[PDB]
Structures are given as C-alpha cells and as structure tokens.
Amino acid sequence: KREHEREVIQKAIEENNNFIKMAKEKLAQKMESNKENREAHLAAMLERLQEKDKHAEEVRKNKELK
Amino acid sequence: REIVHIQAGQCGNQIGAKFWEVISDEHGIDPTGSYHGDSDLQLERINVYYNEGNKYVPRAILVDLEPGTMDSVRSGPFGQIFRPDNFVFGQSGAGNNWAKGHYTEGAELVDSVLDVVRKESESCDCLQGFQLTHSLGGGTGSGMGTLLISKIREEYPDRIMNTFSVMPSPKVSDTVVEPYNATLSVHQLVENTDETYCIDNEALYDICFRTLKLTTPTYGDLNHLVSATMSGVTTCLRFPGQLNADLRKLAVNMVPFPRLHFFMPGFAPLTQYRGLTVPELTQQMFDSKNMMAACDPRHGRYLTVAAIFRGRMSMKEVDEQMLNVQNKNSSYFVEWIPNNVKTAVCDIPPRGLKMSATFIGNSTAIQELFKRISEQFTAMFRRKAFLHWYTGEGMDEMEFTEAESNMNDLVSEYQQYQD
Numbered sequence: 001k002r003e004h005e006r007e008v009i010q011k012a013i014e015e016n017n018n019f020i021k022m023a024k025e026k027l028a029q030k031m032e033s034n035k036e037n038r039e040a041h042l043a044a045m046l047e048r049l050q051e052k053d054k055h056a057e058e059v060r061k062n063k064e065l066k
Numbered sequence: 067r068e069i070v071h072i073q074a075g076q077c078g079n080q081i082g083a084k085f086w087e088v089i090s091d092e093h094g095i096d097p098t099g100s101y102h103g104d105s106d107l108q109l110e111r112i113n114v115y116y117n118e119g120n121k122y123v124p125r126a127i128l129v130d131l132e133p134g135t136m137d138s139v140r141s142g143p144f145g146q147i148f149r150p151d152n153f154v155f156g157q158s159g160a161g162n163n164w165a166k167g168h169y170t171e172g173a174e175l176v177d178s179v180l181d182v183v184r185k186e187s188e189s190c191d192c193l194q195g196f197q198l199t200h201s202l203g204g205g206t207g208s209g210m211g212t213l214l215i216s217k218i219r220e221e222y223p224d225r226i227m228n229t230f231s232v233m234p235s236p237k238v239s240d241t242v243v244e245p246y247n248a249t250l251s252v253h254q255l256v257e258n259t260d261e262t263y264c265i266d267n268e269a270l271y272d273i274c275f276r277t278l279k280l281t282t283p284t285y286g287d288l289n290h291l292v293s294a295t296m297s298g299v300t301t302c303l304r305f306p307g308q309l310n311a312d313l314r315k316l317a318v319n320m321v322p323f324p325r326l327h328f329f330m331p332g333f334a335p336l337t338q339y340r341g342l343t344v345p346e347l348t349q350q351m352f353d354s355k356n357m358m359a360a361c362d363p364r365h366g367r368y369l370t371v372a373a374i375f376r377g378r379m380s381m382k383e384v385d386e387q388m389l390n391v392q393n394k395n396s397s398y399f400v401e402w403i404p405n406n407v408k409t410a411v412c413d414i415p416p417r418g419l420k421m422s423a424t425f426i427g428n429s430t431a432i433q434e435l436f437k438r439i440s441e442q443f444t445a446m447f448r449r450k451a452f453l454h455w456y457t458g459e460g461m462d463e464m465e466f467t468e469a470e471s472n473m474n475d476l477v478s479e480y481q482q483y484q485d
C-alpha cells in the first residue's frame with residue numbers, strides 16, 4: 001500500500017512537470033516560427049523594392065544610351 | 067486501557083470537540099482540566115479518555131490540513147483542556163479531494179501526527195486502541211483520516227481501531243464529489259477498522275427537521291445528536307459498572323464477520339422534564355426515527371444488538387422491555403446468532419436527562435446506506451464527471467472502479483446473511 005501511495009504522488013509530480021515542459025516547448029516553437037515568418041515577409045518586401053530600384057537605374061541607362 | 071482519540075478534518079474536529087465537552091461534563095472536568103465531581107465514579111475510569119497538578123487532559127490529537135477548524139476549537143469553551151502539542155495541522159488544505167489527503171497533501175502531515183500518537187501510546191499503560199472521528203465525504207478526514215488509520219495499523223497492529231464515520235448525504239452536501247470521497251473511504255474502513263459507527267448526516271437532519279421540528283437545521287443541530295450518540299456508545303467505556311465494555315470485547319460480541327463492522331447507532335430521548343418510562347425509552351431506542359443511520363431495521367435483520375440505559379430506572383422493567391421487543395420482533399433477529407441482543411444499565415444519566423437509552427446494532431439493513439453512496443458514485447462515474455480533480459493528483463479510474471466494486475460486495479454480504 002505504501003509503494004502505491006508513493007507512486008501516485010510521483011505520478012502527479014511527473015504530470016505537472018510534463019505540462020510545464022510541453023507548454024514551454026510549444027511557446028518556443030511558435031515564437032521562432034512567427035519570427036522567421038515575419039522577417040521573411042520584410043525581406044521579400046525589401047527585395048521587391050530593390051528590384052524596382054534596379055529597373056529605375058536601367059531606365060536611366062536607356063535614356064543615356066539615346 | 068487508555069483510548070487514543072484522534073479527530074481529523076472540519077467535521078471530525080467539530081464533533082470530536084463536543085464529544086470531549088460532553089464527557090468532560092459527565093466526568094466533572096471543567097475547561098481548565100480540574101475536577102469537581104461529587105461522585106468518584108467519574109474519576110474511576112477517567113483514564114480511559116484523560117491523562118492526569120491533578121488535572122485531566124483529554125487523550126486527543128487534533129488533525130487538520132488547515133488551521134481554521136483547529137483554531138476555532140482552541141477558542142472553544144474546552145479549548146484550554148486540549149493539550150497544545152496534540153494540535154497538529156497544516157496550511158495547504160485538502161480542497162475536498164480524498165487524493166489531496168490520502169496521497170498528495172497529507173503524506174506530509176501524516177508523519178507529524180503519527181509522532182504525537184506514538185507519544186500518547188507510550189504513556190498509555192495498556193493501549194486499548196484508537197478512536198477516530200471524521201467525515202467520510204470530505205478531504206482531510208475522508209482521505210487523510212483513512213491514511214492515518216493505515217499508518218496506525220502498521221505501527222499498532224494489536225490495537226482495536228474504531229471510527230465514528232459521518233456518511234455524507236445529499237440533504238447536507240458540500241460538493242458534488244462527496245460520493246467519490248465516501249466510496250474510497252468506505253473501502254479503507256472495511257479493511258482497517260474493527261468498528262465503525264455510521265452516522266448519516268442525512269438522518270440527523272431528518273430527525274431534526276421532522277421530529278425535533280427544526281425547519282433549517284444547522285450543522286450544530288446534527289452535531290448535538292452526534293455528541294449525544296457518542297457519549298452513549300462510549301458510556302460503558304467511560305463509566306465503571308457491571309459491563310466494563312472495551313473495544314476488543316465490543317468487537318468480539320458484535321462482529322460475526324469482519325467486513326461487517328458497520329453499526330447503526332440509536333438514541334432516545336431525542337431532544338424536557340418528563341422522564342420517559344422504561345417502556346418509552348425502549349420503544350424509542352429501537353424506533354427507526356431514533357436511529358442516527360438512515361436505514362430501516364425492518365428492511366433487514368439484526369445480527370447483534372447492544373443497549374445501555376443511563377439514569378435511575380427499574381432494572382427489572384428494563385429487562386422486561388428488552389425481552390418484549392425481542393419476542394414481538396423475533397423475525398428481525400438472526401436465528402443463527404443465539405442471544406444476539408444484550409443490555410446494560412448505567413446509574414449516571416446523560417447530561418440534562420433523567421434517563422436515556424443508546425442503541426448499537428449490526429443490522430443487515432445498513433446496506434441501504436452503502437447502496438445510496440454506490441448509486442451516486444455510479445451516476446457520476448459512468449460519465450467520469452469531476453474525475454479530473456482526482457486524476458490530477460495521480461489517481462486512476464481503476465482505483466475508483468475497485469472501491470466502487472468493494473462497496474457493492476459489502477452490500478451483497480449484508481444481504482446474504484439477511485436471507
């Protein structure tokens with residue numbers, strides 16, 4: 001009977017810990033995924049703008065050519 | 067033959083506190099522990115529940131997972147009489163979870179309590195065994211109480227274990243999960259108690275509401291019937307007489323089979339200046355409406371029965387009444403147990419009554435009580451309702467299943483012999 005008593009309470013301990021663990025990991029995954037995503041978006045908007053800058057340089061070179 | 071009293075949880079601590087007050091009065095002990103009784107009878111067996119500046123101290127250990135209940139007792143009239151070191155409580159509380167008491171938050175304090183018990187048991191010249199008070203349907207006394215019983219049994223496997231267990235009732239309920247706690251407690255007791263006085267918080271109400279005509283009985287009301295019943299059963303132990311009952315002999319004579327150690331208390335006069343007649347006391351004593359368990363004796367059969375009449379009265383007339391009852395009600399008495407009923411008379415009457423009668427019966431009808439609890443458990447357990455509060459502590463449905471089953475077996479056993 002005493003062992004089972006020690007088993008129950010250790011089970012409840014391990015239950016709580018496991019929850020805290022899973023919680024911590026999940027939050028860490030979602031923070032990094034979001035962070036990557038957001039930076040990607042920003043990096044693509046910047047690259048589009050840079051490609052528009054190059055087109056303007058080329059338009060300026062086309063006029064100079066004539 | 068000292069008796070180590072032990073009270074756990076709110077209910078357990080409240081009823082136990084009155085019990086001490088009552089028996090202190092009868093034994094002429096005031097709150098300070100000093101004695102002023104006019105008769106030596108009072109001091110003749112006072113050591114059964116007291117230890118002696120020529121002051122008697124109750125041999126009681128108070129146990130709770132929250133200070134509140136124990137602090138009230140300390141503030142109570144006899145709060146002084148209780149030994150301060152015997153006060154033993156924590157701060158977590160048991161949130162009404164057997165688990166929280168029998169597993170999680172009790173395993174701590176239990177050791178502390180076992181130490182006081184050990185100290186009381188050492189001083190005791192001949193330890194008769196242990197007396198416990200608790201509410202089977204709560205958290206500290208339901209769960210932690212049964213845990214202390216198990217611990218106690220391991221340390222003192224040669225001592226009698228007796229519990230005044232307060233069966234929970236829908237009429238007087240605190241939480242939906244009270245059936246669960248009761249079923250677990252029931253199975254603990256089935257195995258680790260030699261004697262269990264089932265005091266249904268239901269009946270008490272009824273009595274109060276109906277008979278005593280109290281529309282809104284409070285817990286004090288019920289407790290008042292409880293203290294009286296307590297003094298009754300404990301009379302033969304407290305006061306000297308022809309039958310110096312003891313826990314072991316009490317078990318030897320009323321328990322035909324171990325599992326069947328659950329008794330229906332009964333008291334009369336259910337409170338008055340008109341002392342009842344010996345016939346009156348005897349008809350009320352066996353009256354259903356005077357039993358503290360909410361079971362009909364007529365629906366079952368008395369394995370064994372024991373009566374006590376306190377107060378000045380005709381011993382012969384007493385014996386005549388008892389004989390009449392048995393003869394008129396022969397069908398309600400098991401034939402296989404010859405002479406299954408016995409009576410005893412004490413000269414000192416209960417406090418404020420010219421004479422009273424206390425009834426202790428091992429009736430197969432007691433199964434009604436366990437059937438009620440089992441149905442409740444079944445209702446919720448079929449849908450696993452509220453079980454997360456226990457699974458969170460580390461318990462497992464299987465354990466609920468087992469306890470449910472055992473209580474059903476016990477119900478079956480009472481019926482078998484009934485028929």
Ligand SMILES: COc1cc([C@@H]2c3cc4c(cc3[C@@H](Nc3ccc5[nH]ncc5c3)[C@H]3COC(=O)[C@H]23)OCO4)cc(OC)c1OC
Nearest residue numbers: 299302309311312315316319370371372373374406408410
């Ligand atoms: C109602 O009164 C009481 C009776 C008892 C039981 C008891 C219970 C019984 C019974 C007989 C006896 C009786 N047994 C006994 C013992 C020694 C004997 N020696 N010589 C004869 C003799 C007889 C009691 C004397 O001691 C007990 O503890 C016993 O019949 C069926 O149920 C305990 C009590 O305490 C709670 C008590 O108070 C209320």
Ligand SMILES: Nc1nc2c(ncn2[C@@H]2O[C@H](COP(=O)(O)OP(=O)(O)O)[C@@H](O)[C@H]2O)c(=O)[nH]1
Nearest residue numbers: 075076077080201204205206207234238285288
């Ligand atoms: N007769 C009686 N029953 C009580 C009392 N206090 C609580 N109860 C019952 O006890 C059950 C709840 O248990 P509780 O006392 O709160 O146990 P705890 O966790 O250890 O305090 C409920 O069914 C109430 O019916 C009391 O003072 N007298």
Ligand SMILES: [Mg+2]
Nearest residue numbers: 076077204240
């Ligand atoms: Mg409570």
Ligand code: NA
Nearest residue numbers: 158170171174
């Ligand atoms: Na803790």
